[PDB]
Design an enzyme around this catalytic site. Structure first.
Site, short mmCIF file in Angstrom:
data_model
loop_
_atom_site.label_atom_id
_atom_site.label_comp_id
_atom_site.label_asym_id
_atom_site.label_seq_id
_atom_site.Cartn_x
_atom_site.Cartn_y
_atom_site.Cartn_z
N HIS A 190 35.06 -20.28 30.75
CA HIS A 190 34.81 -19.83 32.37
C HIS A 190 36.11 -19.05 32.62
O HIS A 190 37.22 -19.20 33.40
CB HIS A 190 35.20 -21.17 32.99
N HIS A 249 33.12 -13.98 31.38
CA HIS A 249 31.99 -14.76 31.85
C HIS A 249 31.75 -14.18 33.50
O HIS A 249 30.73 -13.81 33.77
CB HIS A 249 32.34 -16.36 32.05
N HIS A 288 32.77 -15.71 41.02
CA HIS A 288 32.12 -17.04 41.41
C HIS A 288 32.81 -18.08 40.64
O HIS A 288 32.84 -19.27 40.99
CB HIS A 288 30.78 -16.91 40.81
N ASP A 289 33.79 -17.75 39.55
CA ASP A 289 34.46 -18.89 39.03
C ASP A 289 36.00 -18.73 38.78
O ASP A 289 36.67 -19.33 38.13
CB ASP A 289 33.99 -18.88 37.45
N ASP A 340 24.29 -16.67 36.19
CA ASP A 340 25.44 -17.77 35.75
C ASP A 340 24.92 -18.39 34.24
O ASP A 340 25.86 -18.55 33.57
CB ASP A 340 25.62 -18.96 36.74
N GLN A 374 20.82 -29.03 23.78
CA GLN A 374 20.48 -27.23 24.04
C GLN A 374 18.90 -27.57 24.51
O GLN A 374 18.61 -26.84 25.46
CB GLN A 374 20.93 -26.51 22.82
#
Ligand SMILES: Cn1nc(-c2ccccn2)cc1NC(=O)c1c(C(=O)N2CCC2)cnn1C
Ligand SMILES: [Mg+2]
Ligand SMILES: [Zn+2]
Length: 313
Positions: free
Chosen positions: A68, A72, A106-107, A217, A269
């Protein structure tokens, strides 16, 4: 004003593709972002000196966590760039301004822990923001940087254009809460299939931008297999650290966060691709047909995780 950003030929061509990887050279990521703003929005939409100062303050406010992080931020901005450039005429001048900035921010100030861990730790942010805890913090941090002296990239917008763009960024950043994604997509799926979807209806645009944010994202799952696979390592490095911190609170974490249950990652996954990624890019492709390469790449990486389980790698 006549100062165009240019990338070397391989980046100039490959940056236009959904599956582009921004590379391991940290010091190119800012130029790559300005390049994308210049082609996506125009050389005129931001004062270069203010943009540069905003970008570098945003970089400074991402932490050195395994996933993060600043890489990213720019990766999610590039995926948005690819959606905007493949859907030129569907978005307003302000949406093209707001959304690339929304993706970069956004993070902001992420510590590499879920909203759940903040709530179980009883972190102060969990008292300030009862739902979408980190996402409310990321928006707040975005506003904080916009208000630093000489950092206001929106300074030349009207009073109402300014309120609209900050509203676009807020909703876009909130929608990156994967808890809100499920309901947002079911709604979008119904609206598309009953033919009620209306891109003139502001509440409908809001939902579509939210799906685009989830798509950007999650975009590690839409890269070349070796990018997808090596990004999964960074993702799980955070998950396992959070699992460790849950154990320190006397709580058995979910298997996803348990570094003892590393064996269960391939199946995990598969679950994620089937429950989240595939439906996301499916609904997105139905609303925005030129985004089909994201769905195609995601399906290819699902097949790669299926090959891992079958021991063919
Ligand atoms: C939801 N879930 N569950 C498992 C799983 C379950 C059981 C065992 C092993 N793993 C893995 C995932 N998610 C991801 O792997 C993921 C995310 C993500 O959830 N978040 C939230 C932070 C980004 C994003 N990109 N990718 C690849
Ligand atoms: Mg987030
Ligand atoms: Zn993110």
């Amino acid at each position: 004003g006549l100062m165009q950003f240019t990338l070397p030929v391989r980046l100039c061509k490959e940056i236009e593709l959904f599956h582009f990887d921004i590379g391991p050279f940290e010091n190119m990521w800012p130029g790559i972002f300005v390049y994308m703003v210049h082609r996506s929005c125009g050389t005129s939409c931001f004062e270069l000196e203010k943009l540069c100062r905003f970008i570098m303050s945003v970089k400074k406010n991402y932490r050195r966590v395994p996933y993060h992080n600043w890489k990213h931020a720019v990766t999610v901005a590039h995926c948005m760039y690819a959606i905007l450039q493949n859907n030129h005429t569907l978005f307003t001048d302000l949406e093209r301004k707001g959304l690339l900035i929304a993706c970069l921010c956004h993070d902001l100030d992420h510590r590499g822990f879920s909203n759940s861990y903040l709530q179980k730790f009883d972190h102060p942010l969990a008292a300030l923001y009862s739902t979408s805890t980190m996402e409310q913090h990321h928006f707040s941090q975005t506003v904080s940087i916009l208000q630093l002296e000489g950092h206001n990239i929106f300074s030349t917008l009207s009073s109402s254009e300014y309120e609209q763009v900050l509203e676009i960024i807020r909703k876009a950043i909130i929608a990156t809460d994967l808890a809100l994604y499920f309901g947002n997509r079911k709604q979008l799926e119904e609206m598309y299939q009953t033919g009620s979807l209306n891109l003139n209806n502001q509440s409908h645009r809001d939902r579509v931008i939210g799906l685009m944010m989830t798509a950007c994202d999650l975009c590690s799952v839409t890269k070349l297999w070796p990018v997808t696979k090596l990004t999964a390592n960074d993702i799980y490095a955070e998950f396992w650290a959070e699992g460790d911190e849950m154990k320190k609170l006397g709580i058995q974490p979910i298997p996803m966060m348990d570094r003892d249950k590393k064996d269960e990652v391939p199946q995990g996954q598969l679950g994620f691709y089937n429950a989240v990624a595939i439906p996301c890019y499916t609904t997105l492709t139905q609303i925005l047909p030129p985004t089909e390469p994201l769905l195609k790449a995601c399906r290819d990486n699902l097949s790669q995780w299926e090959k891992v389980i079958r021991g063919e790698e």
